[PDB]
């Protein structure tokens, strides 16, 4: 029995690779067939999790067949929710991917939601926003195939084409502006996919905010400010060295800025991107495709899923764009700077201007409140100080030298 | 029309003195231009380009054993030469077997050059096997010093540098993925490689240092360090110019270290010039020191001069995966550092003793080779990648109190 | 007073039209009585060269060439309408009258143009081979061009001499230089969706296959390796010549350039054997017609570039598919650079996207007609270039501004 | 009610194809049979002009034939009605501000956008009244008037004159011109004859324009002139690229001292204008010349393209046209011969400027021409083709770089 195997079995079995309060209970159960399952699994902590279960209990492995199963019921229970779409196939065989993440038939990839929001609180929005996006025609992304969601229904597994000849952004971007340093592109060359990523995410939102949009209350409004000026007393109480000493001079400067968030109340608030930059967008033979739809990471877990405003994912792409231009000058022996420096400024206004175009063409100019661009973007370069200190030490110089750009 | 009068009619030589027929048209011209710079053109009257013939008639030349030996040139074939065809300083891969390199600028007259057909020929004939496979050498001769013009060795495709390997090394090591004996296997690999390198190259014999060589050793590293102090900004330049007066003590040793064994040296050597190729390693670039002019490449160098180019650039390897690394845990790292070059010394000394060659490396050269060899990492930065000052000031850091 | 005695005491500008702003005396080597006073006349001049000249006598016993609106065309029409000369007729053609000259021609009865061979090959050459096309697109069911109603050859030795053709009029009917570029301008100010922007492109590419298809049943010939080796040489030439004479930054670029297309052109000795059928030659929008949704094909005479006695040579159908596939490229261009307040971000991307919709379409199309081998892929790269290097010496020749449009091309053929 | 159906109705109402609303109807103008001329404000006082017809008049429901049928024969003291000897009752409408084409020889053009209660608007209907009643007759046959009564300044409406079908305008005509000239189908003097016209016709233009007054240009007015060409100079230096940009930046001081000379001009006199005076603004329908447009310069503030202007500068504008019809001809005609063409290019200034001054002469009223601008207004309008290059047609720049290498070295 499925209960009474999964209580027996070691609290460990909800882990593809430490320590799990026992014993577990099955919430739920989804029967594959052949001896294959999706389980709800809940420790001794009311922690809850996607286990892909198999027969001999132990947990599916890649080559198994658990995730190979679950396309097959895509391709044809209350408490379960298989939404499939079109151009979802019955492939076979399995291969991880350390991106848990299962290729199916080397065109799919399965991704398990290892760990779940407790009974009743939000998690991952990812199955409402690729359901918007397919829903609306927005097709620069990779096509979707399947969503499993446990009945907002939380996500268990999704599953989406496999682009093997894909590189995300910090790949194709910092090569173009290389390209661009050394001669072998020109100006307008390297433009031209700063302009395609503004169309791209006017498409993306417009196709997003056919759900809804919701008015910023002044509680809203009010509760922004105060993250972000306690994000930025965190970071100049870690940030150290001269960056550090920059940014505790900053810091009244900034502040100032984020308190003109308060007049901004009644701005719209639609589905958002969340955790929007070039690294979410996988370039294939010159077609884009925007992937990871799970929320910023630096939000708590029941807040990934709120409506933010437009100029959040805006920021977000356009603070990247400067952040691809000092990568490359940093990291590049006998770069010449003066090109990356003035495709920096040119890449964020080909964005800008390609991105109000397509909102204007789609009707859907009020999404987008440019009021929010400075306090957001001086938000997004505060949280590339906290990102230094706690993975990537001396990634300090993004900040400081984009701040000293943006602080004339 | 003749060879003389047909070239004599300027961009044939970018991609007549001398002249190599290989049949069929094609032949190789050391062609000399009003400068009285010489170039090696493969002629075919167009300059050969990849798939005209002319490097593939080079390798038929060299697989055919027997040939009368032209009066100006020196063709030395090896085993690895065979008849493969299709094509692929300029290189032309010939049938996806053989590399064919032509050296496009040749130093003047009665100037020495590359040495690397040197290099070359004494490796594969003491049994030296850890390089691609050798298969000819065309060379000019002029007066006990050949003219190197064309170097064929064999094809690795899947072959990374250690740029490549080793950092991936390092970067499993950290994440557990690689037990650190793992680790320390290919740097203890590395110097049983060296050792025979050395060995090899010193049966063309050793030449002993002068007074006049060791004294110029300490005027070359004393002003580096002066152009390093004078060059390095911010808290980095700080330390050292701090810690300048204590290198500039031990390059002072140098003074007593007249007679110390000279030999035919790799002159570039570093991880990065070592390929991991079916399992096994290649050494690769036998063309001399880069930073010395084009005329002092040839030259012999204390053998201990390669080994701190890698233990250098093995404790760079490190300094890399812990500055790129997100989330690393750099005690692992760091212990890799001082224990691959315990593996390198330890193999490399022991190696050299098997074949009757320890007194080829002479360690007390080690540490002001080795302060020189990082400084030159500061002047690397300043003109080249400014960030770059963090791996000679960590490397110094450890090697400072325990030298 | 008989027609060869007044052309030998005519002025030698007789055999000329109104280019008059010619070696005597002159000599008449055939006369097509076409009645009335009216005939064709094929007079040699002293220099040995041959012209086509529709003559009319006068009245008072002397002769003049014909003008638009003498009847000598209106003659011709009828004579078609019912040995030395061929009158072929096909079916449509009328004893319409009527004349009205055209710069481009007399178009006769307000239906039917008529156009004389003016310039003729010497006595032996073979010349325009636009009366062989028009036959083979005929006798094929190729119908995708102007209505023909008859042709005027002179009977001479392998080829019939060209002296005359008549086609269907079609009056407002636009070249693809009008519809193509009129077509974008709209696709750039959302006029047209992208979709249907590319049919045109798509409708060409079945155009061509169906034409080439045609003409490849007169037979094909396998390129020699001599024949090979002059593309090479032509092309090489070429090159040389527009980097010798572009001026201005696109010159500097021309030059850092050479070389890299210059690599290309060695590509051609490895393609001996290649199929060449006949070919339309000068082959771009410019010679396609709209006319109410239905395309049409002009201009058969050959490609100017070439001497008058090789424009009749069998080429490889990719040189027809270059020519198309550039001037598609040009069209959009000339859309940017030319109209004002302009979004290029839609042009630029229908200049992939025309490329691509012609190819697929005239691969299907040689697919569906089983006429796969007529088109060697291999000669599309080198082809390309020599096309783009033509545009430079036809700037410094004829329209100096025009190097921005090879600089453009090149400018993303390169780094690609 | 015509006001309360106005009042409730859906504020794009005044849109022919984003409004404030409600709509309130200032005045209506009831043509009949339920066809009527609405001037509409929105919420945000901006009047419109809206035909109106009872179930926005769309082009065949009938009311611009109603207009038409109107002006041959005011039925309200609001508005003018102003008739002329020419209109006829025509039937048949189709579209082509909105211009209608009503029994194909009559457009009817709507001032859709209406000005500001008490500012200026487009001195179309004034210009047109003027010209007819000082016999002027190159242009297209006036029909009718119809204005808003408002004070001193009746706010003009609609506006319907003679349709030409088969006439091009001057950068038709003029480039075919000049091309026939360099291929030798046209003598010199066949090719400088229009030019000679034009300017026969410019200056009875302002003869009549003069005859409805003549104000003295003030110190302030002189001197505003070279404030505003200064930084138009100025922007297009400082936009300008490649060589042509270095020649202008190279150019600007001596430019720019010209522009100084202005404040002696003070009292020079000022003249209703044509406001947007070149070639393309002159039809030439079976022999003769019509010219059209009287809007104003567009770059102006809509409030002032009613302002008088010196008569110069309609005569630069033309003389700048002409140049620049013989550097598009050079421009874009292959195996073209410039000789002639460049020959043509001061030979149809002068032709222009002798007829003009003659012809002023005739009319005794060479006083509206004050040749000392003609220099430093010809700059400013080359300096203005900088500006719509780099604005709207980038290889543009060409035009005004080969002017002024040809004007500099003349005129100094
Ligand atoms: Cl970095
Ligand atoms: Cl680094
Ligand atoms: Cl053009
Ligand atoms: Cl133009
Ligand atoms: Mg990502
Ligand atoms: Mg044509
Ligand atoms: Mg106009």
Same mark, same amino acid.
């Given at each position: 029995?499925?209960?009474?195997?999964?209580?027996?079995?070691?609290?460990?079995?909800?882990?593809?690779?430490?320590?799990?309060?026992?014993?577990?209970?099955?919430?739920?159960?989804?029967?594959?067939?052949?001896?294959?399952?999706?389980?709800?699994?809940?420790?001794?902590?009311?922690?809850?999790?996607?286990?892909?279960?198999?027969?001999?209990?132990?947990?599916?492995?890649?080559?198994?067949?658990? @995730?190979?199963?679950?396309?097959?019921?895509?391709?044809?229970?209350?408490?379960?929710?298989?939404?499939?779409?079109?151009?979802?196939?019955?492939?076979?065989?399995?291969?991880? +991917?350390?991106?848990?993440?299962?290729?199916?038939?080397?065109?799919?990839?399965?991704?398990?939601?290892?760990?779940?929001?407790?009974?009743?609180?939000?998690?991952?929005? /990812?199955?409402?926003?690729?359901?918007?996006?397919?829903?609306?025609?927005?097709?620069?992304?990779?096509?979707?195939?399947?969503?499993?969601?446990?009945?907002?229904?939380?996500?268990?597994?999704?599953?989406?084409?496999?682009?093997?000849?894909?590189?995300?952004?910090?790949?194709?971007?910092?090569?173009?502006?290389?390209?661009?340093?050394?001669?072998?592109?020109?100006?307008?060359?390297?433009?031209?996919?700063?302009?395609?990523?503004?169309?791209?995410? /006017?498409?993306?939102?417009?196709?997003?905010?056919?759900?809804?949009?919701?008015?910023?209350?002044?509680?809203?409004?009010? /509760?922004?400010?105060?993250?972000?000026?306690?994000?930025?007393?965190?970071?100049?109480?870690?940030?150290?060295?001269?960056?550090?000493?920059?940014?505790?001079?900053?810091?009244?400067?900034?502040?100032?800025?984020?308190?003109?968030?308060?007049?901004?109340?009644?701005?719209?608030?639609?589905?958002?991107?969340?955790?929007?930059?070039?690294?979410? +967008?996988?370039?294939?033979?010159?077609?884009?495709?925007?992937?990871?739809?799970?929320?910023?990471?630096?939000?708590?877990?029941?807040?990934?899923?709120?409506?933010?405003?437009?100029?959040?994912?805006?920021?977000?792409?356009?603070?990247?764009?400067?952040?691809?231009?000092?990568?490359?000058?940093?990291?590049?022996?006998?770069?010449?700077?003066?090109?990356?420096?003035?495709?920096?400024? @040119?890449?964020?206004?080909?964005?800008?201007?390609?991105?109000?175009?397509?909102?204007?063409?789609?009707?859907?100019?009020?999404?987008?409140?440019?009021?929010?661009?400075?306090?957001?973007?001086?938000?997004?370069?505060?949280?590339?100080?906290?990102?230094?200190?706690?993975?990537?030490?001396?990634?300090?110089?993004?900040?400081?030298?984009?701040?000293?750009?943006?602080?004339?």
């Amino acid at each position: 029995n499925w209960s009474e195997l999964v209580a027996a079995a070691d609290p460990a079995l909800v882990l593809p690779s430490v320590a799990v309060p026992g014993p577990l209970r099955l919430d739920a159960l989804l029967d594959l067939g052949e001896g294959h399952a999706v389980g709800v699994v809940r420790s001794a902590d009311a922690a809850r999790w996607t286990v892909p279960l198999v027969r001999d209990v132990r947990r599916s492995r890649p080559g198994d067949g658990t @995730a190979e199963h679950l396309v097959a019921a895509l391709a044809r229970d209350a408490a379960f929710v298989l939404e499939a779409f079109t151009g979802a196939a019955p492939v076979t065989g399995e291969r991880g +991917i350390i991106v848990e993440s299962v290729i199916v038939g080397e065109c799919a990839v399965v991704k398990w939601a290892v760990r779940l929001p407790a009974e009743g609180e939000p998690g991952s929005p /990812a199955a409402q926003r690729i359901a918007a996006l397919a829903r609306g025609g927005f097709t620069e992304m990779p096509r979707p195939w399947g969503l499993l969601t446990l009945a907002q229904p939380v996500l268990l597994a999704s599953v989406v084409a496999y682009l093997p000849g894909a590189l995300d952004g910090w790949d194709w971007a910092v090569d173009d502006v290389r390209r661009l340093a050394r001669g072998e592109l020109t100006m307008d060359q390297a433009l031209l996919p700063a302009a395609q990523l503004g169309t791209l995410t /006017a498409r993306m939102h417009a196709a997003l905010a056919a759900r809804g949009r919701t008015p910023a209350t002044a509680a809203d409004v009010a /509760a922004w400010g105060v993250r972000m000026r306690e994000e930025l007393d965190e970071a100049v109480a870690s940030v150290p060295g001269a960056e550090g000493e920059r940014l505790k001079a900053w810091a009244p400067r900034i502040a100032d800025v984020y308190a003109e968030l308060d007049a901004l109340a009644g701005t719209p608030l639609i589905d958002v991107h969340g955790d929007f930059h070039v690294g979410q +967008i996988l370039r294939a033979d010159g077609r884009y495709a925007v992937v990871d739809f799970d929320g910023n990471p630096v939000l708590p877990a029941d807040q990934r899923a709120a409506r933010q405003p437009a100029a959040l994912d805006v920021v977000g792409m356009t603070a990247s764009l400067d952040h691809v231009g000092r990568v490359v000058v940093f990291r590049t022996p006998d770069v010449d700077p003066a090109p990356v420096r003035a495709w920096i400024a @040119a890449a964020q206004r080909s964005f800008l201007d390609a991105y109000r175009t397509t909102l204007a063409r789609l009707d859907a100019d009020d999404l987008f409140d440019d009021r929010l661009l400075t306090p957001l973007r001086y938000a997004q370069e505060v949280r590339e100080y906290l990102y230094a200190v706690r993975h990537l030490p001396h990634w300090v110089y993004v900040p400081d030298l984009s701040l000293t750009d943006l602080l004339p």
